[PDB]
Design an enzyme around this catalytic site. Structure first.
Site, PDB file in Angstrom:
ATOM      1  N   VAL B   8     -81.260 -23.948 -70.023  1.00 48.01           N
ATOM      2  CA  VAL B   8     -80.775 -23.429 -71.301  1.00 48.01           C
ATOM      3  C   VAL B   8     -81.869 -23.501 -72.349  1.00 48.01           C
ATOM      4  O   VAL B   8     -82.702 -24.405 -72.334  1.00 48.01           O
ATOM      5  CB  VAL B   8     -79.513 -24.172 -71.810  1.00 48.01           C
ATOM      6  CG1 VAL B   8     -78.306 -23.831 -70.951  1.00 48.01           C
ATOM      7  CG2 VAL B   8     -79.741 -25.679 -71.885  1.00 48.01           C
ATOM      8  N   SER B   9     -81.860 -22.540 -73.264  1.00 50.31           N
ATOM      9  CA  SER B   9     -82.847 -22.505 -74.330  1.00 50.31           C
ATOM     10  C   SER B   9     -82.463 -23.529 -75.399  1.00 50.31           C
ATOM     11  O   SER B   9     -83.305 -24.298 -75.858  1.00 50.31           O
ATOM     12  CB  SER B   9     -82.951 -21.098 -74.925  1.00 50.31           C
ATOM     13  OG  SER B   9     -83.836 -21.074 -76.030  1.00 50.31           O
ATOM     14  N   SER B  10     -81.191 -23.543 -75.788  1.00 53.79           N
ATOM     15  CA  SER B  10     -80.694 -24.544 -76.733  1.00 53.79           C
ATOM     16  C   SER B  10     -79.423 -25.206 -76.203  1.00 53.79           C
ATOM     17  O   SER B  10     -78.961 -24.893 -75.104  1.00 53.79           O
ATOM     18  CB  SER B  10     -80.432 -23.913 -78.100  1.00 53.79           C
ATOM     19  OG  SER B  10     -80.270 -24.910 -79.095  1.00 53.79           O
TER      20      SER B  10
END
Lengths: 115, 124, 124, 115
Positions: B8-10
């Site tokens: 996941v990016s964030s």
């Protein structure tokens, strides 16, 4: 129910295998042609399955073939190709499935034509 | 055995869903990474995941984009897995590895799908 | 330099056309073979052709099917040429290697076309 | 001539670049929308070019997008995407070109939708 369609143009083709193929997958009736197609298409109603052994059987004209597939789509008749079973669900994401349906059908139509 | 990879990016992205997806499709272990899918050089967890898997294992992601957002890289990774004879599965594409009669068409399908999705993932 | 490869199953196939096509698109030399496109193990001329070409050369065929009628083989051959940095051209697909702005799409196109045609050629 | 179409839905989008993009490739007139599309489509006549920056601009509905491309096809209006110039001739075999046109357009429609 399940409707079948079979075509051979000349006087030397293995029609038996084809008809037996259509029979194999559950064709209760089979329209064989050497307008028969018209009959076949007008016969099928909502909820039926329309089956061929291959798209080339169905035609060798990109435009027309596509038009016919769209016709069946309009009428909500399931098109199936006995040489392409499971063609409906390659992945499990119906959208992608639809897209791939289209692709395959088109690759095949183009092939059928170009030959 | 079945190895899963999650990225996941964030943290406002629903990571739980992804992990539960990987768990459901049989992840015994999951390599979880908080990182951009723009490259692998900045993804040592992916490296660990790939080196971990061996011939006979299954490698599972929720989406190709999870695997990355770079056509060449993704392709090279898929081929890497093929070479090591590790089964790549995409849980959002459950019926993709299903042998459905005609190997030629099947492989053609795989290549196609994977490449379309590779490009999609990249262009975004 | 530009190397061409020509194959025919029999001699009633218009080989002249093919050779003239390869000549036209710039074949300095043409490796001509009378053989089935079903495999390369029975195609030593193709082998010579492939070993002949080096980084900087162009490899030209009239059609992928000329190159073969086997998906895996054809693909492996195309990748072989890519690895050696030899330009594969298909004279019936003259505008395929034309850089048209967006490399991603371009490469995607190539891969796609080549694979479709590989399968087509095989299935026949 | 060359007609342009541009769309942005919300109140924070780089519309300038888009309009300038349509301008770049030769848009003499541009229909901008925040029915305008209807106007755009009914405006174009045989021989014109209809251009967008991207298919997502044109829509995010597989079915509809396809329907619209077919509409333009019927009317013999050249569809062009400024981000996909040269899209017409990838290879030089018009048949394959047509097929690829279709593919690309569909990949893109699917993408536009799924987002």
């Amino acid at each position: 129910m399940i409707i079948g369609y079979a075509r051979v143009s000349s006087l030397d083709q293995n029609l038996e295998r084809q008809l037996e193929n259509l029979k194999t997958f559950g064709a209760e009736k089979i329209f064989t042609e050497k307008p028969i197609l018209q009959k076949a298409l007008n016969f099928v109603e909502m909820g039926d399955r329309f089956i061929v052994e291959s798209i080339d059987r169905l035609g060798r004209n990109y435009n027309e073939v596509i038009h016919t597939v769209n016709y069946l789509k309009d009428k909500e008749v399931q098109l199936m190709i006995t040489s392409l079973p499971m063609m409906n669900e390659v992945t499990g994401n119906p959208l992608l499935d639809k897209f791939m349906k289209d692709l395959i059908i088109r690759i095949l139509a183009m092939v059928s034509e170009q030959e």
